[PDB]
PDB file of C-alpha atoms in Angstrom:
ATOM      1  CA  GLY A   1       5.787  -4.488  10.332  1.00 49.77           C
ATOM      2  CA  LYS A   2       2.054  -3.996  10.765  1.00 48.87           C
ATOM      3  CA  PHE A   3       2.715  -0.421  11.907  1.00 52.27           C
ATOM      4  CA  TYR A   4       4.934   0.347   8.901  1.00 54.75           C
ATOM      5  CA  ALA A   5       2.404  -1.045   6.437  1.00 54.24           C
ATOM      6  CA  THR A   6      -0.373   1.090   7.914  1.00 55.72           C
ATOM      7  CA  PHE A   7       1.954   4.115   7.907  1.00 54.39           C
ATOM      8  CA  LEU A   8       2.423   3.696   4.155  1.00 53.78           C
ATOM      9  CA  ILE A   9      -1.336   3.497   3.667  1.00 54.59           C
ATOM     10  CA  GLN A  10      -1.909   6.763   5.492  1.00 55.57           C
ATOM     11  CA  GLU A  11       0.938   8.462   3.665  1.00 52.19           C
ATOM     12  CA  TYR A  12      -0.505   7.343   0.313  1.00 52.54           C
ATOM     13  CA  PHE A  13      -3.949   8.686   1.231  1.00 54.08           C
ATOM     14  CA  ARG A  14      -2.317  11.839   2.532  1.00 55.43           C
ATOM     15  CA  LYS A  15      -0.187  12.529  -0.566  1.00 57.24           C
ATOM     16  CA  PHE A  16      -3.064  11.415  -2.817  1.00 57.21           C
ATOM     17  CA  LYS A  17      -5.167  14.358  -1.666  1.00 56.31           C
ATOM     18  CA  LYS A  18      -2.406  16.819  -2.534  1.00 56.42           C
ATOM     19  CA  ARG A  19      -1.781  15.060  -5.835  1.00 57.58           C
ATOM     20  CA  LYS A  20      -5.407  15.523  -6.781  1.00 54.50           C
ATOM     21  CA  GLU A  21      -5.282  19.213  -5.805  1.00 57.66           C
ATOM     22  CA  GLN A  22      -2.431  19.592  -8.255  1.00 56.17           C
ATOM     23  CA  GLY A  23      -3.495  17.384 -11.123  1.00 57.76           C
TER      24      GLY A  23
ATOM     25  CA  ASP B   1       6.386   2.676  -9.717  1.00 60.08           C
ATOM     26  CA  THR B   2       6.289   6.425  -8.918  1.00 58.61           C
ATOM     27  CA  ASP B   3       3.192   5.917  -6.809  1.00 57.98           C
ATOM     28  CA  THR B   4       2.639   4.332  -3.405  1.00 56.06           C
ATOM     29  CA  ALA B   5      -0.198   1.940  -4.314  1.00 58.23           C
ATOM     30  CA  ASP B   6       2.214  -0.742  -5.458  1.00 58.25           C
ATOM     31  CA  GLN B   7       4.016  -0.278  -2.159  1.00 57.94           C
ATOM     32  CA  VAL B   8       0.813  -0.442  -0.093  1.00 58.67           C
ATOM     33  CA  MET B   9      -0.169  -3.589  -2.018  1.00 58.62           C
ATOM     34  CA  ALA B  10       3.127  -5.295  -1.199  1.00 53.94           C
ATOM     35  CA  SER B  11       2.721  -4.174   2.405  1.00 55.55           C
ATOM     36  CA  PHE B  12      -0.855  -5.453   2.483  1.00 54.27           C
ATOM     37  CA  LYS B  13       0.245  -8.795   1.080  1.00 53.98           C
ATOM     38  CA  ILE B  14       2.792  -8.960   3.915  1.00 53.24           C
ATOM     39  CA  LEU B  15       0.165  -7.682   6.384  1.00 57.18           C
ATOM     40  CA  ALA B  16      -2.056 -10.705   5.747  1.00 56.41           C
ATOM     41  CA  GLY B  17       0.844 -13.037   5.015  1.00 58.09           C
ATOM     42  CA  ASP B  18       1.036 -13.680   1.266  1.00 55.62           C
ATOM     43  CA  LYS B  19      -2.746 -13.762   1.138  1.00 54.01           C
ATOM     44  CA  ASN B  20      -4.926 -12.006  -1.436  1.00 52.18           C
ATOM     45  CA  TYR B  21      -7.607 -11.878   1.227  1.00 53.49           C
ATOM     46  CA  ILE B  22      -7.433 -10.470   4.744  1.00 53.12           C
ATOM     47  CA  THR B  23      -9.564 -10.796   7.862  1.00 55.99           C
ATOM     48  CA  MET B  24     -12.138  -8.004   8.306  1.00 59.84           C
ATOM     49  CA  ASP B  25     -11.352  -7.594  11.990  1.00 61.66           C
ATOM     50  CA  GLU B  26      -7.587  -7.809  11.356  1.00 62.58           C
ATOM     51  CA  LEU B  27      -7.614  -4.837   8.982  1.00 59.32           C
ATOM     52  CA  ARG B  28      -9.974  -3.086  11.430  1.00 59.64           C
ATOM     53  CA  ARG B  29      -7.271  -3.639  14.026  1.00 61.28           C
ATOM     54  CA  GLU B  30      -4.641  -2.086  11.789  1.00 61.04           C
ATOM     55  CA  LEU B  31      -6.605   0.711  10.158  1.00 61.18           C
ATOM     56  CA  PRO B  32      -8.930   3.091  12.051  1.00 61.76           C
ATOM     57  CA  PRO B  33     -12.652   2.096  12.114  1.00 62.33           C
ATOM     58  CA  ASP B  34     -13.405   4.880   9.604  1.00 62.08           C
ATOM     59  CA  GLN B  35     -10.933   3.683   6.993  1.00 61.60           C
ATOM     60  CA  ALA B  36     -11.368   0.035   7.966  1.00 59.53           C
ATOM     61  CA  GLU B  37     -15.145   0.139   7.534  1.00 57.17           C
ATOM     62  CA  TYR B  38     -14.723   1.836   4.154  1.00 58.76           C
ATOM     63  CA  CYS B  39     -12.147  -0.793   3.180  1.00 54.45           C
ATOM     64  CA  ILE B  40     -14.421  -3.630   4.331  1.00 56.44           C
ATOM     65  CA  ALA B  41     -17.281  -2.235   2.255  1.00 55.67           C
ATOM     66  CA  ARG B  42     -15.002  -1.528  -0.722  1.00 57.39           C
ATOM     67  CA  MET B  43     -13.627  -5.073  -0.647  1.00 56.24           C
ATOM     68  CA  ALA B  44     -15.029  -7.987  -2.620  1.00 60.61           C
ATOM     69  CA  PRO B  45     -16.080 -11.517  -1.509  1.00 59.67           C
ATOM     70  CA  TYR B  46     -12.613 -13.189  -1.284  1.00 62.30           C
ATOM     71  CA  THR B  47     -12.881 -15.328  -4.475  1.00 60.41           C
ATOM     72  CA  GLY B  48     -10.218 -17.970  -4.890  1.00 56.88           C
ATOM     73  CA  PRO B  49      -9.439 -21.706  -4.644  1.00 55.63           C
ATOM     74  CA  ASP B  50     -10.359 -21.652  -0.950  1.00 57.22           C
ATOM     75  CA  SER B  51     -13.271 -19.953   0.772  1.00 58.23           C
ATOM     76  CA  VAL B  52     -11.712 -17.928   3.573  1.00 56.69           C
ATOM     77  CA  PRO B  53     -14.431 -17.081   6.175  1.00 58.49           C
ATOM     78  CA  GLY B  54     -14.194 -13.686   7.881  1.00 58.41           C
ATOM     79  CA  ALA B  55     -11.714 -12.648   5.229  1.00 62.22           C
ATOM     80  CA  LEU B  56     -12.332 -10.792   1.987  1.00 66.36           C
ATOM     81  CA  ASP B  57     -10.360  -9.909  -1.134  1.00 63.91           C
ATOM     82  CA  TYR B  58      -8.279  -6.801  -0.445  1.00 60.74           C
ATOM     83  CA  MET B  59      -7.095  -6.461  -4.055  1.00 59.49           C
ATOM     84  CA  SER B  60     -10.574  -5.259  -4.933  1.00 61.16           C
ATOM     85  CA  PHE B  61     -10.107  -2.237  -2.654  1.00 63.39           C
ATOM     86  CA  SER B  62      -6.868  -1.219  -4.350  1.00 63.95           C
ATOM     87  CA  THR B  63      -8.539  -1.773  -7.707  1.00 61.68           C
ATOM     88  CA  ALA B  64     -11.546   0.360  -6.812  1.00 64.36           C
ATOM     89  CA  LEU B  65      -9.207   3.012  -5.435  1.00 63.31           C
ATOM     90  CA  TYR B  66      -7.007   2.764  -8.531  1.00 63.73           C
ATOM     91  CA  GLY B  67      -9.769   3.860 -10.884  1.00 59.97           C
ATOM     92  CA  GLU B  68     -10.131   7.637 -10.715  1.00 60.08           C
ATOM     93  CA  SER B  69     -13.039   9.570 -12.207  1.00 58.59           C
ATOM     94  CA  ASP B  70     -10.763  12.384 -13.333  1.00 59.55           C
ATOM     95  CA  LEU B  71      -7.550  10.665 -14.422  1.00 60.85           C
TER      96      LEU B  71
END
């Protein structure tokens, strides 16, 4: 649903930060 | 594939309803003003076979976000 889609967006942004900190 | 951009894209597509463009206020209703405003500004003028007013191309956001300056 709309809430699940947004959840995925936030998770991507969230994990993206960590990914960048790693390489 | 091993990312979550492809997933977000599919979810966005479903969010708007098989539309490559989404309403500015609709995404602002889903995403927080901070992210929503950034998304709105990062989006591109719809562009397609039908001028959708109040709605802009979301694919441009994912494209802009896809290109890293250190990857």
